[PDB]
DNA sequence: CCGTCCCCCGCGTTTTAACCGCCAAGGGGATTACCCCCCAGTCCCCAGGCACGTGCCAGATATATACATCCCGTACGCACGCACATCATTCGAT
């Protein structure tokens, strides 16, 4: 029951609003808690952060590439 | 670098059990006496061990060959997302 990756990683974000910026662990733990997905779902969910965040529609507030926190950029 | 928690930290109770001060007993550590029996001292000595030679052996030493193993590639599955058409929804016309 997993549609394509842009919706829960929006949808989670929303979930918890930090000014800050969600942290990459905070949508990791929460999609897969709540949601199911594959068995290399960690592994989709890295580049998927990845990818989106060259779509330039979510902002990194800290850290580089995948490792630090990541805002909805509104 | 990022983050993430939890698990030590200060801090406030409050219990107590160390710490004190005193009293007592006697075991035993410290001290003396007696001595015998025990190890050092000699002489003689004699065979155990050491210095020297010696070879034989096997211990080695070298050969060739089989086998065990590792890595990479290969293939192949698979479950996957992306992409796609289709199904279903939505704006306009009705």
Request: charged fraction near 25%; avoid cysteine; glycine fraction near 8%.
């Amino acid at each position: 029951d997993h549609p394509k990756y842009s919706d829960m990683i929006v949808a989670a974000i929303q979930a918890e609003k930090n000014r800050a910026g969600s942290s990459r662990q905070s949508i990791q733990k929460y999609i897969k808690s709540h949601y199911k997905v594959g068995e290399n779902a960690d592994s989709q969910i890295k580049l998927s952060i990845k990818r989106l965040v060259t779509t330039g529609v979510l902002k990194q507030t800290k850290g580089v590439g995948a490792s630090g926190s990541f805002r909805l950029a509104k």
